[PDB]
Design a protein around this ligand. Sequence first.
Ligand code: QYB
Length: 338
Amino acid sequence: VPRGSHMIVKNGEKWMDRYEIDSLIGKGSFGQVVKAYDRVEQEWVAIKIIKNKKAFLNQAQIEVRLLELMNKHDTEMKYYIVHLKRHFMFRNHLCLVFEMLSYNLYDLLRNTNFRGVSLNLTRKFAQQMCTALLFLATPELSIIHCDLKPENILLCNPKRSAIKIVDFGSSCQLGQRIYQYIQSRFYRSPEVLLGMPYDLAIDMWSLGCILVEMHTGEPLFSGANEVDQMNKIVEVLGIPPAHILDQAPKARKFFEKLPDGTWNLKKTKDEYKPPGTRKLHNILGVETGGPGGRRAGESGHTVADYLKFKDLILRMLDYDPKTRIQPYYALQHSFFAA
Ligand SMILES: O=c1[nH]cnc2n[nH]c(-c3ccccc3)c12
């Protein structure tokens, strides 16, 4: 019986006279992902190998149950989600066999040298992601992904704009509270930072952040810790509304209630732009040729196009999760008309 939790995997070895192991795609907390040729189906697959560890095996059983639930739906909307082909036990590890995809949206940004992709490509990513979220919001699914980030959104083909969401290892269904901290820090919703109840809206918050990063090349809110994260949100969006902070268990981590009942930033031990003064209008360069002026003298980047982009993002970054734009209504936004 092996001492480590990981599976030993030798490039070039062949599993069950079927999977020819090519190379390591990625490592993580969960275990590893390998590129393999399925000699039976004559196609590439990505094999996700789960650590022989109770917590990761539990997360992977949740991922299997949610992916298999999604598979039973007829709608074409399900093809924005990575397809789990099959799962088995091999050498005492749970192995998930997925369709092989191309590189993630972070890799794509790195290929631009973090200058961002065009508004037209951003629009195509946005429409596919809102469609994916509409699918997850189907009542019989009600799935919160809980870890949307550029690294979890993969191109199907390196030449094309088609994308798929991966990694439902941290996911839950509406009304569940399983893990103490959720969402990747840069993409973490205000309701999660505040310890308030969360629903499918946290995913629309993450999507708002992601789409700005895809067009500018840089994370909108790049916090080094939760206090820094909330302070960077506040630079762009202002102090959250009183009706939220009055109900937030962790309001006093970030904010203080003054004698007149109004909320301010908490005094530091002893730096940020004043609240609401880092305008998304200027981050996007609506009137000034896009990010760093680099999109003036290109087409598909008009002031009119930027205003529609800005208006949709600010609906996704609503502090109030009951009024934040829902996928069903995001898809009807004029940003998608053209
Ligand atoms: O990481 C991955 N790289 C390339 N193709 C992939 N297909 N599915 C995955 C994957 C699926 C679930 C969780 C993590 C990665 C891939």
